[PDB]
Amino acid sequence: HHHHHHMVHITLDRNTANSWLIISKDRRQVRMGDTHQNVSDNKERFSNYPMVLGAQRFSSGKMYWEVDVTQKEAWDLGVCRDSVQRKGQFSLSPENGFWTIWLWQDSYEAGTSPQTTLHIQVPPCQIGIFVDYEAGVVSFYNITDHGSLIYTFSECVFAGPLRPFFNVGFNYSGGNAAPLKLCPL
Numbered sequence: 001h002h003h004h005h006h007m008v009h010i011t012l013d014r015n016t017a018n019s020w021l022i023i024s025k026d027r028r029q030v031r032m033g034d035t036h037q038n039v040s041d042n043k044e045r046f047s048n049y050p051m052v053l054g055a056q057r058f059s060s061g062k063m064y065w066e067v068d069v070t071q072k073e074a075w076d077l078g079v080c081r082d083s084v085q086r087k088g089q090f091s092l093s094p095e096n097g098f099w100t101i102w103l104w105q106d107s108y109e110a111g112t113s114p115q116t117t118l119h120i121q122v123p124p125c126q127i128g129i130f131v132d133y134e135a136g137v138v139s140f141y142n143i144t145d146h147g148s149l150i151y152t153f154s155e156c157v158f159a160g161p162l163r164p165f166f167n168v169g170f171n172y173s174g175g176n177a178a179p180l181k182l183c184p185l
């Protein structure tokens with residue numbers, strides 16, 4: 001792909017984080033803590049899952065960023081509407097305002113309803129995410145495999161401002177403690 005020139009500097013929004021997340025000082029890395037991180041509750045925080053949003057809001061244009069997923073067993077990545085549900089249980093789907101892929105139990109899937117199997121020969125250590133607001137496109141790229149396409153959501157109905165979306169996953173296994181990291185431009 002040739003989307004690298006639309007690179008944007010994403011930072012994480014502490015106020016949206018689940019209360020167990022630890023966001024680095026530079027707001028570029030997030031991981032699961034082993035306990036509540038001693039913050040007050042607020043209506044923005046994802047309550048049920050280890051999720052956080054980027055601070056940036058996008059309503060036009062083309063945007064690209066990269067995320068490091070090295071040695072994680074489980075995670076979700078993509079974009080979502082600014083007005084997604086924060087509290088209780090929900091599925092990741094375009095109907096609920098999410099355009100995402102994930103790793104879970106040694107398989108990669110796109111967050112369609114129902115979910116779509118992905119065909120990845122080279123397990124990615126870094127994922128590129130491209131959004132074309134006007135075209136209604138969200139695409140995912142395998143940076144470890146020379147930028148190969150993973151998945152394209154097209155005919156997207158955003159229906160609002162978009163925010164970068166992250167889920168570090170639970171760590172029931174003890175094998176999923178590693179952070180998500182926003183990679184330098």
Ligand SMILES: O=C(COC(F)F)N1C[C@H]2CCC[C@H]2C1
Nearest residue numbers: 094095099153154155156157158
């Ligand atoms: O955004 C989409 C589909 O495009 C892309 F995601 F593949 N949508 C929005 C959802 C609400 C109506 C049915 C669902 C279709």
